[PDB]
């Protein structure tokens, strides 16, 4: 998905893997 | 008592849209219609309260 | 001679619907790069054009 993602010179900028989801609950 | 009144005369819906590309948002619509890739939420008091 | 003159083709009815296209079991779905998943499945998608369609 290199084509979706804004080129910081000619990599894909693309984010991390591991976040995806959240976690945050009320104290936990 | 004190003579406060509220009146409420129209409402209207509204709702912003992402204009995503038709063939990448009928990618991201058939593989969010999986029922591995169901969007699960969570309250964030997450508490039942007496 | 009964039948046609020219042999019918470009749509099966629903008895071939019924033998072809049994329900798609699609183990590790959309694990692949983009391109390479069923977009077939999708109702909005052209196969020769390889895009979605549109109200126009």
Not at chain 1, 3 to 26: C, E, K, V, Y
Not at chain 2, 33 to 46: C, G, H, I, P
Request: charged share 15%.
């Amino acid at each position: 998905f290199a084509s979706l993602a804004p080129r910081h010179g000619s990599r894909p900028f693309m984010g991390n893997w591991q976040d995806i989801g959240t976690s945050n609950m009320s104290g936990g | 008592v004190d003579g406060a009144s509220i009146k409420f005369d129209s409402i209207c819906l509204y709702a912003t849209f992402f204009p995503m590309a038709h063939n990448t948002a009928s990618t991201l619509e058939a593989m969010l219609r999986n029922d591995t890739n169901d969007q699960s939420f969570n309250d964030y008091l997450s508490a039942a309260n007496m | 001679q009964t039948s046609s003159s020219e042999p019918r083709s470009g749509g099966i009815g629903t008895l071939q619907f019924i033998e072809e296209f049994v329900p798609s079991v699609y183990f590790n779905p959309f694990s692949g790069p983009p391109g390479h998943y069923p977009d077939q499945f999708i109702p909005n998608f052209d196969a020769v054009k390889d895009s979605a369609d549109g109200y126009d």
